[PDB]
């Protein structure tokens, strides 16, 4: 019976989110196919000791900790197969600037942009060429939209506090979607809506709250969406699964984000996207294991 | 004194190059500054234990083992500063196809290329837009299978089978006839440019003949070309996010430098190119090592 390590780790929030991911997996893995080995990482490199007996690492990780590529690099070196994209692909997909460069070279639609450095200053020369308004995002991955001349400036200050690196994009307003890819096949598309929500007990107001529905899109747009989301997957060297976040504007989808390590809880987008296609959660984990195994073998 | 791990590792040939590199550094590290500890990895992940007590990791690695970025991501995650570029920058520079896509985006001259995978069959029409003759290189590089020129379609088909057992991906470029040069960057400054020419060599005892014989010299380039080479070389270093040092290999044709290779982990023995170049600049070997340490510490600090 194949020993499946369920890998959890990170710090603070991400650790929480990782644990909640790991517990969902640990509960839904077929116990007849698998021997389940929950693994909780105190420190990242404690992974080598723990991984010493398991036959596969099913990554429950979330955030930079599972996206930077170290864990994948480490697992490769121990010769343990593991789920999801590899080190180079994880790393690239977590870098917004490098990602967009590889995307534009393929002529895949993504908003024009500019990169900004903590130490460096912005030559207004290249900046204002994309004009207004703008969105400022950290390069490694909140949102600040900037309408005016002075608008931009105020943000970089605090974004540079946190991220040594920032991307400034021209702001496209359109209809948001997310496209999960599993093993080169596009799963059902999900549309993301924003609606204001009031919480009486905490007395909280939120407009950033999300509503996600599976809606069949016009077959014309559905084609142009599936083309692009599979092109990203290919171009960024993703494997076994990925989530492409997109923005549709006047008929044309633009790539907003590429997630090599998307939410794996049952309310997460990719597990919903799959379920709509008739793949229930427990089987989803089977596919991730079997496709990951095959992919790792091709790699080496 | 700061404790400096000299990190050696790899398999087969690379590990020899590594041990050699690591022994030169050990012999030349300034012992008034540094308590010197050699570290020889039988397996890559032995690093976590073997590095527990060191203040800095000076990488003596060579080849993919120090290029793919596992070692850098590892040291990062342990909080031990290390020499040279970070995990992402190494990974990118080791990948020919991704590297060319990123340099091309900036309009840095590099020759046209096609990538082939062992799953996809190489349509010869997409490859005929290249034409002849062609250089075939494994996408992820390496010592094992080398870079090879192929003049016609048949010589190509062979060369593809030879590479594909060793590499999933292969990059195929227009060949450009020209003058070879190598440009070492140190901490964003250009060191003296090295010119490389070829001459056949006969070896009597082993009864061997080598027309692949290389001659490497530091010769002042005409001022214009030198300014054009120095612009391009630095733009490569910045575009691939390298740091503390890198070696950019270039082919000059009709006054135009083209990027052949970007190395985040070039040869560090005194007979290697980056050391010779630093030496032509009056930075001798022991000071080169201090510089790599000091600068790497500065960079790792900046990186959060």
Curated annotation (Swiss-Prot), chain B:
InterPro entries named among the record's database cross-references: ATP-grasp, ATP_grasp_subdomain_1, D-Ala_lig_Van_CS, D_ala_D_ala, Dala_Dala_lig_C, Dala_Dala_lig_N, PreATP-grasp_dom_sf
Main location per the UniProt record: cytoplasm
Reaction equation(s) it catalyzes: 2 D-alanine + ATP = D-alanyl-D-alanine + ADP + phosphate + H(+)
Keyword hit for Zinc-finger: no
GO MF term set: ATP binding; D-alanine-D-alanine ligase activity; metal ion binding
PROSITE patterns documented for this protein: ATP_GRASP (PS50975), DALA_DALA_LIGASE_1 (PS00843), DALA_DALA_LIGASE_2 (PS00844)
Pathway(s) it belongs to: Cell wall biogenesis; peptidoglycan biosynthesis
Binding positions (Mg(2+) 1): 249, 261
Pfam families the UniProt entry points to: Dala_Dala_lig_C, Dala_Dala_lig_N
One GO term (biological process): peptidoglycan biosynthetic process
Domain ATP-grasp: 100-294
Residues binding Mg(2+) 2: 261, 263
EC numbers on record: 6.3.2.4
Function: Cell wall formation.
Protein family per UniProt: Belongs to the D-alanine--D-alanine ligase family.
Full protein name: D-alanine--D-alanine ligase
Organism per entry: Bacillus anthracis
């Amino acid at each position: 019976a194949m020993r499946i390590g369920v890998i959890m780790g990170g710090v603070s929030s991400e650790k929480q989110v990782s644990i909640m991911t790991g517990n969902e997996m640990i509960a839904n893995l077929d116990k007849n196919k698998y021997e389940i080995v929950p693994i909780t990482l105190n420190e990242k490199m404690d992974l080598i000791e723990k991984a010493k007996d398991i036959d596969f690492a099913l990554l429950a990780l979330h955030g930079k900790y599972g996206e930077d590529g170290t864990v994948q690099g480490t697992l490769e070196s121990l010769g343990i197969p593991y789920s999801g994209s590899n080190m180079l692909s994880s790393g690239i997909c977590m870098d917004k600037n490098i990602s967009k460069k590889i995307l534009r070279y393929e002529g895949i639609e993504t908003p024009d942009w500019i990169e900004l450095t903590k130490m460096e200053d912005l030559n207004f020369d290249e900046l204002d060429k994309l004009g207004f308004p703008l969105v400022v995002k950290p390069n490694s991955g909140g949102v600040k939209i900037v309408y005016d001349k002075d608008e931009l400036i105020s943000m970089l200050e605090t974004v540079f506090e946190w991220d040594s690196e920032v991307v400034i994009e021209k702001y496209i307003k359109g209809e948001e979607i997310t496209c999960s890819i599993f093993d080169g096949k596009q799963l059902p598309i999900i549309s993301i809506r924003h609606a204001a929500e009031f919480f009486d007990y905490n007395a909280k107001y939120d407009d950033a709250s999300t509503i996600e529905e599976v809606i069949e899109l016009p077959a014309e747009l559905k084609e142009r969406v599936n083309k692009a989301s599979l092109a990203c997957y290919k171009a960024l060297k993703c494997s076994v699964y990925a989530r492409v976040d997109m923005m549709v504007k006047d008929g044309i989808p633009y790539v907003m984000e590429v997630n090599t390590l998307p939410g794996m809880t049952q309310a997460s987008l990719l597990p919903k996207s799959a379920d709509a296609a008739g793949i229930h959660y427990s089987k989803l984990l089977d596919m991730i294991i079997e496709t990951s195994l095959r992919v790792r073998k091709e790699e080496g």
